Amino acid sequence: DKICLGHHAVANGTKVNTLTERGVEVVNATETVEITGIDKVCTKGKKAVDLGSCGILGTIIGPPQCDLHLEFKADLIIERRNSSDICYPGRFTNEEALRQIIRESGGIDKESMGFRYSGIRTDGATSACKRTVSSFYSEMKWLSSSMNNQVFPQLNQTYRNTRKEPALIVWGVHHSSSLDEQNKLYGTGNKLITVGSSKYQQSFSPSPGARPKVNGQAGRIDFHWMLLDPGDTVTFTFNGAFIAPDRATFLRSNAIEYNGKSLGIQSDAQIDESCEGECFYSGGTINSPLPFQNIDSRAVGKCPRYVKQSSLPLALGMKNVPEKI
Amino acid sequence: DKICLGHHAVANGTKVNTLTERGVEVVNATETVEITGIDKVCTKGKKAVDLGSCGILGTIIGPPQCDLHLEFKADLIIERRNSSDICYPGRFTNEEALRQIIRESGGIDKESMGFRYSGIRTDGATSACKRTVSSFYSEMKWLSSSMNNQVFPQLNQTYRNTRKEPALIVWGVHHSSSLDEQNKLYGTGNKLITVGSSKYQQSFSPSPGARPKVNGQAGRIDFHWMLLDPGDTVTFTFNGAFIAPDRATFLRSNAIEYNGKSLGIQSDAQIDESCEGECFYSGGTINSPLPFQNIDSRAVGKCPRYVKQSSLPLALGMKNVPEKI
Amino acid sequence: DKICLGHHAVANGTKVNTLTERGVEVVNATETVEITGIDKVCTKGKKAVDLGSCGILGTIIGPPQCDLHLEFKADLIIERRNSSDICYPGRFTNEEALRQIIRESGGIDKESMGFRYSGIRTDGATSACKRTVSSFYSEMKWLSSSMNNQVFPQLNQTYRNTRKEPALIVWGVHHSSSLDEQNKLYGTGNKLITVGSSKYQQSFSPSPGARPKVNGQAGRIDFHWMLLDPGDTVTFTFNGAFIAPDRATFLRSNAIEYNGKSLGIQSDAQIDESCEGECFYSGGTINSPLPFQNIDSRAVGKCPRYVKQSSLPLALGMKNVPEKI
Amino acid sequence: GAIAGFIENGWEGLIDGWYGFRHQNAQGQGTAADYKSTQAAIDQITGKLNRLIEKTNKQFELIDNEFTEVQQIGNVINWTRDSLTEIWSYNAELLVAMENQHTIDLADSEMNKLYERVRRQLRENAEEDGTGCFEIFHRCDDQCMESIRNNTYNHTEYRQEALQNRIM
Amino acid sequence: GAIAGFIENGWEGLIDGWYGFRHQNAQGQGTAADYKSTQAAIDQITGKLNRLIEKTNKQFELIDNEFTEVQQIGNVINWTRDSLTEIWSYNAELLVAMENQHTIDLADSEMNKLYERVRRQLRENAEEDGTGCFEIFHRCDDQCMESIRNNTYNHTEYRQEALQNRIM
Amino acid sequence: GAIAGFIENGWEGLIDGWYGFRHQNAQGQGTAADYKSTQAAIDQITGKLNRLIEKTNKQFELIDNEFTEVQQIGNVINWTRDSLTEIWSYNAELLVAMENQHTIDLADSEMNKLYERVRRQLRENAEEDGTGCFEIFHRCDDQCMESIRNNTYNHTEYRQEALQNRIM
Numbered sequence A, B, C: 001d002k003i004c005l006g007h008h009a010v011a012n013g014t015k016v017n018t019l020t021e022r023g024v025e026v027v028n029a030t031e032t033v034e035i036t037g038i039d040k041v042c043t044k045g046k047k048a049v050d051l052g053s054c055g056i057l058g059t060i061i062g063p064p065q066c067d068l069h070l071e072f073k074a075d076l077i078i079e080r081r082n083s084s085d086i087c088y089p090g091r092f093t094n095e096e097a098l099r100q101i102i103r104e105s106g107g108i109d110k111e112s113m114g115f116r117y118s119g120i121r122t123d124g125a126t127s128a129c130k131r132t133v134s135s136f137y138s139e140m141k142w143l144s145s146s147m148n149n150q151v152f153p154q155l156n157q158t159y160r161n162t163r164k165e166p167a168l169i170v171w172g173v174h175h176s177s178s179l180d181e182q183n184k185l186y187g188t189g190n191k192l193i194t195v196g197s198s199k200y201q202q203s204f205s206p207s208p209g210a211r212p213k214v215n216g217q218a219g220r221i222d223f224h225w226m227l228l229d230p231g232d233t234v235t236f237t238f239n240g241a242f243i244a245p246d247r248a249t250f251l252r253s254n255a256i257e258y259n260g261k262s263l264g265i266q267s268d269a270q271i272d273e274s275c276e277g278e279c280f281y282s283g284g285t286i287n288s289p290l291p292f293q294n295i296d297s298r299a300v301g302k303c304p305r306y307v308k309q310s311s312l313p314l315a316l317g318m319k320n321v322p323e324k325i
Numbered sequence D, E, F: 001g002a003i004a005g006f007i008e009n010g011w012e013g014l015i016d017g018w019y020g021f022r023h024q025n026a027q028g029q030g031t032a033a034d035y036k037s038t039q040a041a042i043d044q045i046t047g048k049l050n051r052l053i054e055k056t057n058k059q060f061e062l063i064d065n066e067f068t069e070v071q072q073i074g075n076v077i078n079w080t081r082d083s084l085t086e087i088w089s090y091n092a093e094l095l096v097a098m099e100n101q102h103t104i105d106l107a108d109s110e111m112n113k114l115y116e117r118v119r120r121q122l123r124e125n126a127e128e129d130g131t132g133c134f135e136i137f138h139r140c141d142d143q144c145m146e147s148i149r150n151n152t153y154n155h156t157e158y159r160q161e162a163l164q165n166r167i168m
């Protein structure tokens, strides 16, 4: 007698949207926008370093809080909020661009720049860099007269980049608390530092004066840097106010000292080495099957696309047509 | 005998475009791109202020032309072209970012910062700020020696933000016409202003000298500002060249002194309180049913999307197939 | 007995992609992404100038290497890599914005600014600008005392833009190698240059000192410019260190001295006047039928859209269904 | 004097409906709009325009200034604003073309829906003439046409008559 | 007690297939899923979601800073990031709507594919009833139904019987 | 030795047309391209490629420099240019996929258009065989085939012969 053709249905289906229409009911659907993150940085199978209190620029010059990261090796570099790049007050020139460099280095290697000295005080210290006792940047030397109010010598230092990787070279300029204090440490006269590369040439004079007291000190130390091509010499020339480099920084993704290319994330979250993750934000990790996320615009790494919507339901079966009596 | 099925047609229809083809004729169509604006700012049901000649930064310091807007309350703030933020020549530091603040405040409230003085001239005036007679910024005090060539005292002023909203605090630095004129007004010596917050600390010295004559004056006054968190003190310290604040500015969208969040538009058009509008540009208002506009890229508010095309015809009925003989 | 309907097929067809599916085999297809460029700048039917060694800013002031381009007329302007805008070491203020101007001028016209002099040396030269003998910028005059260590006069120069097109006016400030050498050339005293327009007013003082030796010279010359509206006067006032303009530059797309609007490209490639092209990059020319290119993100002119993909195959015939036994 | 359906022709004289029937029998000719299938087309097309707004409207403020310009930063803002404009112009144009293809196709679908409805309603009592029309092989008066139109035609009532007219 | 196909109704009781046959003959009623045409629908829909990732996923790094902000440059970065977000939000939403239209339409197509298959298989031995069903004009037992289902029905075996039931 | 239409198969031997007829009668076999419905497919596909240019081509100039770089501003220009590239790459790829779906579908439509044309032309003189072919129930010589091909077949001439072959 008779044969019918047909398709399945269910009692309640889920509403999706099409180009034409809104709220079409289908048999099956799945979400496409991830709203839920993993509140941990997931480092499983990655080499990670939590810098904790150590600001990342600190791993180059070496304040007390960065003592465990002077040479470090990492695929994933985690910066924290309360972190500080310095002890003795002052800041880096063109900092934000030096960070982005260290963040994607894979870690930094350190080597001694060879400098020796004569008839100078090179062991200058500060209650601002305290270890067991007043100390100073582990990778820098503070250079003073060796006798108070003695005038400081005119000196030249050269260092030549031997390695096939470009070198990070940092130096500082000390800004005394007043014109009196500069005289005490470097003597009277005109103070001039000049730094010369084959691409770089700048000169610096201290600007002494009463600044607000930070970390107990009214003086400042300002750091500057340059990238030194292989086979190139940097020339240091100075008669005072000079914070000199004792080691040069070499990136590890330029070399078994090698460790290719890192991602630097900024996060407030505990590390978890048990979960796997490729995309990170300040709350932790996004690890989802879904193509989009609503969690954070500023996620970094291998990430779902950020979208304003918290839901975009995708159909996985046909339009649901309920059965009739 | 016979039955036909069919659809309507019209004699001439309008051409639209599809993905596949260009110039398909349909029965009915509508434009989607708005090309015609309303040459008025439409403020119906909104609280608007036309600042006219008053530049918006002027509502903080208070030149003669801003006298009616020192405290004002607005959802919609209209800036004009010929407007000026000052009378006595000079400019604001980081101005463009102070404007965007006042533009979205909902209006500003003013309160007295409490400062009193001793053995100073505080009533300094200028032919540049004329009211009935030579005058000065209604919210500022010009501080001079009280006797010509007398040296100006070293003074400290503190003000503490009491309110739960952050405070706008403005101050100025006077730059005399020559080194002679500075001596007349503040006396000889080194002139230094220092301003101290818990997040802010800057210091300013006058730079005296012969500038071009603007508004009849070769001197300058430069204004600076900061935002003061609740329960924080600003510290004023100075021995001359100081234009002091007499009132602090508080935003109204941070408080019935309250008036949430404003839109600041720049427009050449008369106000009309009879039409309604949400999107504005320099020629007036865009109020359209249409999803796109071709009028101005730089429209602000709740706006149709700007597009390069002046026409994108949408079909509202079927492909038009003319009847055959 | 029987009739069938059918469509063609071929033995092997090419795989394309649809929205739904990947690798659908069709009968015919064409590439849409251009991967192959023309390694020449194709100027057929265009007026082109290869500046070669002449940096484009040099066509205004006129070092030896720009001698053939002081007045030039071009639809297409080609800059080269090793090019230099100057001979005597120093740089332009706000350079990148002066380049973009000359690049789209259609060429520059030159006219004498009328200046004459009295009791000065105006024929200053330099081993840095060598022609037959030590020379100087062809469009500038170096102004010195006329007797060593004589103090230099206080002088005023006015030039009024007569033409209906805005004028390019360049001037320089000489920075002597030391305070001694400034004294030799301009005499002792305070050195001040002031430049005054109706929109522009700036002043410049030399900053003398030992800089590194470039092109054999430790001094510097720094050039500055302004755009002068028709009927406006520039006012030069100076008592030394002044590199003065001898000719003003007028753009040709503002005028048969006329030549509308140019495109400035930067390219490493030989010129070929036999091929036609509208889109250029550093490797030459893109001239393709295709709507997209994978060659270079930074192409300029009338260009295919750059895309990351090296292939997006377009179908030009139907889905290929091979015949069955 | 002859009548043809949609397969060749649109009807300039159908002025109170989008879709409709035209017939022929002893009584003479007639045309009638169809309300249900006209309204279903209209329903899918009203709400366009509003949907173009939902999808493409936004809220923003000033980032550059017209009465006092902010030049290095401003030359990139101008360039980025212009770039975003080209993207949104491509998008709007694509959206309208897409919406237009959908209107034209949905209208074709309601015409075919309705013809397929009538075809399966006449069963074996009628034959397709190729022009969007059915030749009916029984005698079909004005109150039988309405029967076909309002979907209450009982094809059995007329089957044997139709088959003696169809076969012989 | 009566049975109807897809043209009106979906079947809440078809629980081991997407598409299927329901029948009626002397033996009684029956329902059977269809594996091939169910699997072909499932195949086109698995691999969605993965295709949304291919098309919209990316690799990037930090350009602004959260623990120490970089303000003139940062007010434009915020504005450009927000602008790109609106573009990608419009795109994602459009992509899902497009994918959803394609799922719904492809499912309709496998149902019509299958009905057209059976229609052309029964030839002249059956007639469409309008609800997605064929009235069969010969005696069709359970092992003849399976014949229609597994695509081995020989319409010739039953043709003369059908035509004496159809015409008279 | 047997012939089948499009429902299973494409024809590797149809080399002067996109669409076509293949036949069978006492005279023997034959194949003929169809000009009108081939050209209509070709017309909709030429003009692609040009339409991809209209929709996606532009005019721009230099904003950064290669021979002397402009770094804070340049690190954002690089980032914004890269971001716009991803948008345009998503767009181009989507546009080609869309165009490709439309080519494949329009070709299917001209094949179905043409089969539906022939079906409604043969009326009751022929029956669908399921493979894209019609079994014709009268004697149909080479000059009658051309009649069906050039759309001048008068189904009435052959109706009674067909019906005595169809029913008995």
Ligand SMILES: CC(=O)N[C@H]1[C@H]([C@H](O)[C@H](O)CO)O[C@@](O[C@@H]2[C@@H](O)[C@H](O)O[C@H](CO)[C@@H]2O)(C(=O)O)C[C@@H]1O
Pocket: A124, A125, A126, A127, A128, A142, A144, A175, A176, A177, A181, A185, A217, A218, A219, A220
């Ligand atoms: C190398 C050296 O002399 N280091 C000093 C250091 C410097 O003298 C000074 O910071 C230059 O800015 O100052 C140290 O602290 C001292 C304080 O204890 C003191 O009470 O004030 C001093 C100046 O008046 C000086 O600040 C320091 O850094 O802690 C002592 C250190 O030996």
Ligand SMILES: CC(=O)N[C@H]1[C@H]([C@H](O)[C@H](O)CO)O[C@@](O[C@@H]2[C@@H](O)[C@H](O)O[C@H](CO)[C@@H]2O)(C(=O)O)C[C@@H]1O
Pocket: B124, B125, B126, B127, B128, B142, B144, B175, B176, B177, B181, B185, B217, B218, B219, B220
């Ligand atoms: C507070 C005070 O002394 N105000 C003066 C003001 C200042 O002396 C001066 O602007 C500092 O820049 O100058 C006033 O105008 C004067 C002119 O009338 C005059 O012809 O030149 C004076 C200096 O030589 C001074 O500019 C003014 O602002 O109008 C007078 C005012 O009392």
Ligand SMILES: CC(=O)N[C@H]1[C@H]([C@H](O)[C@H](O)CO)O[C@@](O[C@@H]2[C@@H](O)[C@H](O)O[C@H](CO)[C@@H]2O)(C(=O)O)C[C@@H]1O
Pocket: C124, C125, C126, C127, C128, C142, C144, C175, C176, C177, C181, C185, C217, C218, C219, C220
């Ligand atoms: C106008 C003039 O005097 N030009 C000098 C020029 C300037 O004196 C100097 O460059 C200012 O920066 O210098 C010229 O070269 C000289 C060298 O030959 C010399 O060995 O050192 C001089 C200063 O000690 C001076 O540099 C030059 O530009 O070549 C000579 C020229 O006449």
Ligand SMILES: *[C@@H]1O[C@H](CO)[C@@H](O[C@@H]2O[C@H](CO)[C@@H](O)[C@H](O)[C@H]2NC(C)=O)[C@H](O)[C@H]1NC(C)=O
Pocket: A028, A029, A030, A316, A317
């Ligand atoms: C119906 O859709 C659901 C998705 O909502 C599919 O189920 C997922 O199936 C995979 C493995 O098949 C599991 O990893 C997921 O966890 C399931 N998702 C959830 C949240 O349950 C299911 O396969 C689909 N089935 C049909 C027949 O459509």
Ligand SMILES: *[C@@H]1O[C@H](CO)[C@@H](O[C@@H]2O[C@H](CO)[C@@H](O)[C@H](O)[C@H]2NC(C)=O)[C@H](O)[C@H]1NC(C)=O
Pocket: B028, B029, B030, B316, B317
């Ligand atoms: C045909 O299209 C027009 C739009 O061009 C529709 O008319 C608009 O109708 C609304 C109210 O229905 C009015 O507010 C508008 O002003 C009309 N537009 C204009 C400019 O006239 C009309 O509804 C459509 N009718 C049909 C049957 O398609």
Ligand SMILES: *[C@@H]1O[C@H](CO)[C@@H](O[C@@H]2O[C@H](CO)[C@@H](O)[C@H](O)[C@H]2NC(C)=O)[C@H](O)[C@H]1NC(C)=O
Pocket: C028, C029, C030, C316, C317
């Ligand atoms: C098949 O597609 C090809 C494109 O691959 C078409 O051939 C191009 O044809 C134009 C002129 O017709 C020539 O300028 C091109 O050089 C050809 N392209 C190449 C690379 O060969 C051809 O027209 C299409 N033919 C059919 C019937 O589809």
Ligand SMILES: *[C@@H]1O[C@H](CO)[C@@H](O)[C@H](O)[C@H]1NC(C)=O
Pocket: D154, D155, D156, D157
């Ligand atoms: C169709 O017509 C026949 C004539 O007997 C009748 O019995 C039947 O109820 C009618 N209605 C339907 C829907 O079959």
Ligand SMILES: *[C@@H]1O[C@H](CO)[C@@H](O)[C@H](O)[C@H]1NC(C)=O
Pocket: E154, E155, E156, E157
């Ligand atoms: C159909 O049935 C007839 C009955 O004779 C038979 O000869 C034939 O082989 C069957 N199969 C096909 C596919 O025709």
Ligand SMILES: *[C@@H]1O[C@H](CO)[C@@H](O)[C@H](O)[C@H]1NC(C)=O
Pocket: F154, F155, F156, F157
């Ligand atoms: C069809 O054939 C019949 C045979 O009499 C004829 O009268 C008629 O004119 C033919 N043409 C058409 C289009 O009906």
